[PDB]
Design a protein around this ligand. Structure first.
Ligand code: HEM
Ligand code: HEM
Ligand SMILES: CNCCc1cc(F)c(F)c(-c2cc(C)cc(N)n2)c1
Ligand SMILES: CNCCc1cc(F)c(F)c(-c2cc(C)cc(N)n2)c1
Ligand SMILES: C[C@H](O)[C@H](O)[C@H]1CNc2nc(N)[nH]c(=O)c2N1
Ligand SMILES: C[C@H](O)[C@H](O)[C@H]1CNc2nc(N)[nH]c(=O)c2N1
Ligand SMILES: [Zn+2]
Lengths: 414, 418
C-alpha cells in the first residue's frame, strides 16, 4: 500500500510507504481528525519491553546493513537476557546515538530536520546526582553554543527504571527568562514562566526581578528532590535586538538567548524512556519574533512596537499588527546575523524542509510531518510548506511529551 | 466526549456533535491526513443511480434530521414525508426535496463546512431554487440573478443557487467555472503567463469553445454552463453585474500604477451539495471575501498573480536574501491595500483579524447550542500572520457532518462531448 502527497504549488507528488512502519497512535480516528490538538490521546512490563526492544534492534541492524547478521542475533539474545534478568536493558553507545538521531528524524513537528544526522550525542547515562547533571548540561550548553556558531546536540541522562527514580530537567528549556506576576496583575519578564519561576523562588532562588533574568536550572537526579543551579553567565549567549532601519528599536530593550534547548521531553528508544534528554539546535527567527515576542500570552510587544511605528491602531483592517510583526521579525534576524549567532529565517527553513522531505521520501519512503506545526506562524502561504501536503504518523524512536515534574513528583525534604 | 482547548484563553469546549459524523476523514489512529486537500473518497451513495436500499436510508436520515430540527420527530408530517419519499424512490429511483428541506439542507451544508471561517453567518443564506431549470440559457439567467442579488451594489449578501440534482450521472448540471467570476490566464509565446495562471486550462477550453479573449491581465472569464448533461455553452456575464475594485494603497500613491484589481463576489461553483443522498452538482454559492484570500493567495502565491516581486521593488526593499523578510513586508502592504480599496469602494470585505475573531465566537456558539463545530485548522488559520489571529491558538476537531459541500471531478475530465 502507498499514500500520495502532492505539493499544490509545484505539483510534485511523493509516495509514502514509510507510514506502514508506524506504531503508536496519532489521536485521530477514522471519523475525527485531531491534527490541531496539541497533546492528543507506570513503566513497561517485561512482556511489553521485548517486542519494542526487538523492533528497535532490528531497525538499528537494518540501518547498518547487518540485519540477520551474527552480531544482530547476538545483540537480540543479549538484550533479551537483560530484560529477562533485570526487567530492562542498556543501549550500546552506537544504538543510543542512532536512537537519538532518529527520534529527531522522526519528529513530525520539527521543520529543522534536514540537519538530523548531524547531532552531537552526549551520553550522560553514568550520571547519578543533580550536580553531575549540571556539569553535563553546562558542557552541552558550551559545546552547542560554540561562540555563536551553534551546533545541534542532545545530552541523554539515565533511562527510567521503576518510574520512582526519574532524571528530569524541571526547566522546559535550558535557557529561558523568568516571569514575575506583579501585584497589579501585570507580568514582568516572560509570562509563560511565571509558575516555574515561583517554583524556583520557593526552592531558594534569589530573583533579580528583571525583564530577562535567565532562570536557574532545576535538576532532578534519580527521583530525588530537584536542586537549583545557576548556569554560569558566560555560557548564556544573548543577542540584543535592534532593527536595521528603526534606530528606536534598541530602545525597546529587547534581547533573546541564542540557544533553543528543549529539556522537558521524553526520548523513547526501543521501549526505553529517557525522561531527561535536553536537546538543542538553533532558532528559526519566527519562534522569537512571532511567538516569544508577539503572542498575547508572552512578551506581547505588538502594541508598543506599533506605537513607535506611528501605526493607525484604531482598526484591525489597518493591519497594524501584521506590519509591526514583520518589522519585529526583521529585527530578530538582523540582530542574530549581526552578532554572528546562528539563526534561520522561516523562508530558508521551510525551503530546506521541503528539500529534506523530498529526500526522505526518496531514500526512506516518507517523512512524517505535522503541517500545523511545520507551517510558520506568520506568512504561512508564502512559504513552500504551506502548499505541501504532509502525512503525520508516529515513528519510533521518538520524542514524546511527559507530564510536568511538579505535578507528579512526591517531595522528600523536611 | 472530546475536549478542545484554546491555548490563549484556556477556554475548553467539549464536543459531542462528532458522534453524528458520517464520512471518514481519511485519518486513522495511525495516520493523520489533516493537510491532505482531498483526503477521502468516502461517499454516502455509489457514484450513479443508487438502488432503493442505498438511497432510502440516506433520505430517511436527512428527513429524520430535518423533522428533528423543527421539533416534529415522528409527527404526522414526518411519517407522511417518509412514505412520500419511499414512493418517489420506488417510482423514480430518486426523490424531491421540499423547499423548506432544500433551504434547511443548504444552510446546514454551510454550517457543516469545516473549512469555512465565515460560518457565523450560516443561517443568513439566501437560497435560490433553480430546480426547474432545463437549459444552459436558464442556468445563465439564474446565475445572473444570483450575482446581481449577491452583489447588491457592494453590500454583499450570501446566496446559493441550486440547479437540478443528479439523476443517472449522464444528465448532470454543471457550472464548468470553478468560480462564477474569475480572470482568464494565457500562455505567452515566451513561456510566461498573462492573467491568472490557475485558469490557463479553463481559459483554453473557453477559447476553444469560441470565446474571443481580450488577452489582458484581468479578463473576466465567460460562464461555461452545462445543463442536463449536454455540451456546455458559453455566456458572457453582463459586465455591469461584475463588481470590481481597483486596488490602491492608503499611503503608496504608486500602488495604483500596478494596475491591480479584483472582483467583489467570491462565488464557488464547482462543488457538489449533498442533501439526503441527493447530489446537487451545480450549486454556485457566494459570500464575501476575507482580504487575505485576495491579498495573500490570489496576489502572492507563486503560481497565481505572483506580485511580491513587483511590489517589493516599488517599495525599495532589499530583495537579495530571504532574511530581509522583503516578501513578508510587501505581503502586508498588499493586504493593507486590498482592504483599504474594498472599504473605500464600500464593497463588503472582512479582514482576517475580524473574521477569525468571529469564528471563535461562532465556535463557542456552536459548542453551546449544538455540542460542537467541525473545523479544519489547516483551512481556518489565515495564510498570513497566523498566530496573531485567535484561531491559531484554538484546537479544533474536524469531522464530516451531512448535509455537506463536497468536491467533484472537473467536468472536462468526465464529459463525453457530442
Ligand atoms: C538544528 C536546528 C533546528 C531548527 C531550525 C529547528 C526548528 C524547529 C521549530 C521552529 C520547531 C517548532 C518549535 C515551536 O514552535 O515551539 C521545532 C520543534 C521541534 N524540534 Fe526542531 N529544530 C532544530 C533542531 C532540533 C533538534 C536538534 C531536535 C532534537 C534532537 C529537535 C526536535 C524537535 C522537536 C521534538 C520538536 C517538537 C516539539 C513539540 O512537539 O512540542 N529539533 N523545531
Ligand atoms: C459570507 C461570508 C463568507 C466568508 C467571509 C467566507 C470565508 C471563507 C474562506 C476564507 C474560505 C477559505 C477559502 C480558500 O482558501 O479558498 C472559505 C471556504 C469555504 N466556504 Fe466560506 N465564506 C463565506 C461564505 C460562505 C457560504 C455562503 C458558503 C456556502 C453556502 C461557504 C462555504 C464554504 C466552503 C464549503 C468552503 C470550503 C471550500 C473547499 O473545501 O474548497 N462559505 N470560506
Ligand atoms: C516541548 N515543546 C517545546 C517546543 C519548543 C519550544 C521552544 F522554545 C523551542 F525553541 C523549540 C526548539 C527546539 C529546538 C531543538 C530548535 C528550535 N529551533 N526550537 C521547541
Ligand atoms: C472548491 N474550493 C474552493 C474554495 C474557495 C475558493 C475561492 F476562490 C473562494 F473565494 C472561496 C470563498 C467562497 C465563499 C462563499 C466566500 C469566500 N470568502 N471565499 C472558496
Ligand atoms: C491549537 C494549535 O494546534 C496550536 O496553537 C499550535 C498551532 N501550531 C503550532 N506550531 C508551532 N510550530 N508551535 C506551536 O506551538 C503551535 N501551536
Ligand atoms: C497542502 C495544504 O493543505 C494546502 O496548501 C491548503 C493549506 N490550507 C489552506 N487553507 C485555505 N483557506 N485555503 C487553501 O487553499 C489551503 N490550502
Ligand atoms: Zn487527522
Amino acid at each position: 500500500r502507498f499514500l500520495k502527497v502532492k505539493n499544490w504549488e509545484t505539483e510534485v507528488v511523493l509516495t509514502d510507504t514509510l507510514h506502514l512502519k508506524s506504531t503508536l497512535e496519532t489521536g485521530c480516528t477514522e471519523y475525527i481528525c485531531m491534527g490541531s490538538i496539541m497533546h492528543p490521546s507506570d513503566v513497561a512490563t517485561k512482556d511489553q519491553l521485548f517486542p519494542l526492544a526487538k523492533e528497535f534492534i532490528d531497525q538499528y541492524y537494518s540501518s547498518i546493513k547487518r540485519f540477520g547478521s551474527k552480531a544482530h542475533m547476538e545483540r537480540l539474545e543479549e538484550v533479551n537476557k537483560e530484560i529477562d534478568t533485570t526487567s530492562t536493558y542498556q543501549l550500546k553507545d552506537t544504538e543510543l546515538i542512532y536512537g537519538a538521531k532518529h527520534a529527531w528524524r522522526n519528529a513530525s513537528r520539527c521543520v529543522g530536520r534536514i540537519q538530523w544526522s548531524k547531532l552531537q550525542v552526549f551520553d550522560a547515562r553514568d550520571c547519578t546526582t543533580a550536580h553531575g547533571m549540571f556539569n553535563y548540561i553546562c558542557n552541552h550548553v558550551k559545546y552547542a553554543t560554540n561562540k555563536g556558531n551553534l551546533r545541534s546536540a542532545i545530552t541523554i541522562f539515565p533511562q527510567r527504571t521503576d518510574g520512582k527514580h526519574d532524571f528530569r530537567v524541571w526547566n522546559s528549556q535550558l535557557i529561558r527568562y523568568a516571569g514575575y506576576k506583579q501585584p497589579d496583575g501585570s507580568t514582568l519578564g516572560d509570562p509563560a514562566n511565571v509558575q516555574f519561576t515561583e517554583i524556583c523562588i520557593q526552592q531558594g532562588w534569589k530573583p533579580p526581578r528583571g525583564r530577562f533574568d535567565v532562570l536557574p536550572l532545576l535538576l532532578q537526579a534519580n527521583g530525588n528532590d530537584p536542586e537549583l543551579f545557576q548556569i554560569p553567565p558566560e555560557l548564556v549567549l544573548e543577542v540584543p535586538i535592534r532593527h536595521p532601519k528603526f534606530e528606536w528599536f534598541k530602545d525597546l530593550g529587547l534581547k533573546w538567548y541564542g540557544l533553543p534547548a528543549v529539556s522537558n521531553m521524553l526520548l523513547e528508544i526501543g521501549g526505553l524512556e529517557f525522561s531527561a534528554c535536553p536537546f538543542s539546535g538553533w532558532y528559526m527567527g519566527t519562534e522569537i519574533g512571532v511567538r516569544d515576542y508577539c503572542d498575547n500570552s508572552r512578551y506581547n510587544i505588538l502594541e508598543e512596537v506599533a506605537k513607535k511605528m506611528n501605526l493607525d491602531m484604531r482598526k484591525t483592517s489597518s493591519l497594524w499588527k501584521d506590519q509591526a510583526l514583520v518589522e519585529i521579525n526583521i529585527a530578530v534576524l538582523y540582530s542574530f546575523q549581526s552578532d554572528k549567532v546562528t539563526i534561520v529565517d522561516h523562508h530558508s527553513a521551510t525551503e530546506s524542509f521541503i528539500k529534506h522531505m523530498e529526500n526522505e521520501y526518496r531514500c526512506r519512503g516518507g517523512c512524517p510531518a505535522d503541517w500545523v506545526w511545520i507551517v510558520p506562524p506568520m506568512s504561512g502561504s508564502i512559504t513552500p510548506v504551506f502548499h505541501q501536503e504532509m502525512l503525520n504518523y508516529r515513528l519510533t524512536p521518538s520524542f514524546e511529551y511527559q507530564p510536568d515534574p511538579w505535578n507528579t513528583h512526591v517531595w522528600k525534604l523536611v
